[PDB]
RNA sequence: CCCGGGGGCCGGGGGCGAUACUGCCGGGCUAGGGGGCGGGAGAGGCCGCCGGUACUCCGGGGGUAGGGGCGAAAUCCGUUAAU
């Protein structure tokens, strides 16, 4: 008997956030971030930070009764980075090793169908 | 240098001629141009109605305490429940 849930992974260039919830996504069983598992702010987007956060969220979900999960990885969608950051792969790898039953792995980064004006002006981030 | 003769001194007018070229007058054409008909092409324009995701904000439910940012941080957001 497999109780199903969803692992949302937010992999940005500065941090990662793993939220494990029920299959409707309304009930949250666990939620970990890189700042909750890493000493300094410089290591939040580290694959180590994503790996240990995925471990902690997985043990919490297994302890609270979730044994199977789909995976939805994402980055900051719209006027930002349209790809998951550097910790999504490590997070899913730690999820797989934690003993949780994997369903479907999908990218759910929100895509603007046009858009809004992004930051940094018109000369870019360095001029 | 002076004398004598011819030429020019770029022009005006008169007379007699020529009609290729330009102009004028008349007639006729279709080669350029314009006006058409037909089937298509186009982010051409104005006007009206509608949608797509993204986004921000707001209200409620889940769930704690971080989030955001950077080369590193810090200001900043958050325990009136944030991400
Ligand atoms: Mg003489
Ligand atoms: Mg004279
Ligand atoms: Mg003289």
From Swiss-Prot:
UniProt cross-references to SUPFAM superfamilies, sorted A to Z: Translational machinery components
UniProt GO MF annotations: rRNA binding; structural constituent of ribosome
GO biological process: translation
Keyword Ribonucleoprotein: yes
Gene3D superfamilies cross-referenced by the UniProt entry: Ribosomal protein S11
Domain of life from the UniProt record: Archaea
Coiled coil: none
Keywords: Ribonucleoprotein, Ribosomal protein, RNA-binding, rRNA-binding
InterPro entries: Ribosomal_uS11, Ribosomal_uS11_archaeal, Ribosomal_uS11_CS, Ribosomal_uS11_sf
Entry GO CC: ribonucleoprotein complex; ribosome
Quaternary structure annotation from Swiss-Prot or TrEMBL: Part of the 30S ribosomal subunit.
Family note: Belongs to the universal ribosomal protein uS11 family.
HAMAP family associated with the record: Ribosomal_uS11 (MF_01310)
Protein task: Located on the platform of the 30S subunit.
Protein name according to UniProt: Small ribosomal subunit protein uS11
């Amino acid at each position: 008997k497999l109780r199903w849930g969803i692992a949302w992974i937010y992999s940005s260039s500065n941090n990662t956030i793993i939220t494990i919830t029920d299959l409707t996504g309304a009930e949250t069983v666990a939620r970990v971030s890189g700042g909750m598992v890493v000493r300094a702010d410089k290591d939040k987007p580290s694959p180590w930070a994503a790996m240990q956060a995925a471990y902690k969220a997985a043990q919490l979900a297994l302890a609270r009764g979730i044994n199977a999960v789909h995976i939805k990885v994402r980055g900051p969608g719209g006027y930002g980075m349209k790809v998951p950051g550097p910790g999504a792969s490590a997070a899913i790898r730690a999820l797989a090793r934690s003993g949780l039953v994997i369903g479907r792995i999908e990218d759910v980064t929100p895509i603007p169908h046009x858009t809004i004006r992004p930051p940094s002006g018109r000369k870019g981030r360095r001029v």
